[PDB]
Structure 1
Amino acid sequence: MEDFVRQCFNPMIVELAEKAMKEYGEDPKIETNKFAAICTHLEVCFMYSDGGSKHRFEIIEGRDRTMAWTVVNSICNTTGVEKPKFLPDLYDYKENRFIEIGVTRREVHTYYLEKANKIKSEETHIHIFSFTGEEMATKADYTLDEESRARIKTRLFTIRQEMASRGLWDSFRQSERAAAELA
């Protein structure tokens, strides 16, 4: 599963995920499913930022924590938007709102409910993707046009097929359900 992750995502995303996981004390060679999931979330965030006009999104995910909070503080002090309690994934300059991007192998309704109850702020926009082609956004406001989101969903289903053809899909799908049924 580790060699698959290193062959499936580009080395920059792999390096960013390795750094983010070593920061939380987790191991790429052991917790390979979390490695894959973090790589997937990063690729989705980057494709999402690429979906709009050139200057539309400020990328928060993928940065170092302190610098990410610095950019969040700058955005809040210059636009007047409330500071989120948890680090978001993007900022939308066009719609003037923070975006929390989610990718799940689970039920999309349950994941959206979990994230919405975790955020509790009436500002941060939520947008969930899944490996089955479903997506759910705050107020059904999907931010991007249909082409960008469809590309993201196609990439996700391709990742799922690639995992299934080598027999890693079942364990990867049950890993996220294991972190929610245990933690």
Structure 2
Amino acid sequence: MENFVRTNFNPMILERAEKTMKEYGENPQNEGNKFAAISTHMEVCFMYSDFHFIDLEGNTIVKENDDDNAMLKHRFEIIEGQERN
């Protein structure tokens, strides 16, 4: 449901879902199923990639702050959510 997703998900995922879904012609008011699906699909893409970095030695690590800063690199790149091009 439009209000259910807009209540249970954050502005970034809402805006990203609102973007990515606007391509075929459908919209969250009529086609809620795919809006929520893409929203959740997005949320998982976030949760999967967030907080995960790689060390200079080459080791995999997780952290709280999530601001990279030189000594660490993001382990996963988030392809989904960006523009097709």
TM-score by shorter chain over 0.5: yes
Q: Tell me if 1:65 matches 2:84.
A: yes
Q: Which has the higher helix share?
A: 1
Write the distance in 2 (CA, Å) between the matches of 1:51 and 1:31: 32
After TM superposition, which residue ranges in structure 1, 4 or more long, deviate above 6 angstroms?
none
Question: What is the aligned partner in structure 1 of residue 75 from structure 2?
Answer: 56
Write the distance in 2 (CA, Å) between the matches of 1:22 and 1:55: 29
Q: Tell me if 1:24 matches 2:24.
A: yes
Write the distance in 2 (CA, Å) between the matches of 1:27 and 1:55: 33
Write the distance in 1 (CA, Å) between the matches of 2:24 and 2:11: 20
CA-based RMSD of the aligned residues comes to 1.2
Mind listing any 5+ residue stretches in structure 1 that lack a counterpart?
A: 67-183
Q: Which TM-score applies when normalising by structure 2?
A: 0.71
| Alignment deviations for residues 121-154 of structure 1 (CA, whole Å, 9 cap, x no partner) | xxxxxxxxxxxxxxxxxxxxxxxxxxxxxxxxxx
Identical positions, percent: 73
Higher relative contact order, structure no. (Cα contacts within 8 Å, ≥ 6 residues apart): 2
Q: Tell me if 1:9 matches 2:28.
A: no
User: How many equivalent residue pairs?
Assistant: 66
Shift of 1:51: 5.2
Q: Tell me if 1:44 matches 2:44.
A: yes
Shift of 1:24: 2.3
Q: Which TM-score applies when normalising by structure 1?
A: 0.35
Shift of 1:40: 0.1
Write the distance in 2 (CA, Å) between the matches of 1:55 and 1:27: 33
Question: What is the aligned partner in structure 1 of residue 56 from structure 2?
Answer: none
Write the distance in 2 (CA, Å) between the matches of 1:55 and 1:3: 33
Mind listing any 5+ residue stretches in structure 2 that lack a counterpart?
A: 54-72
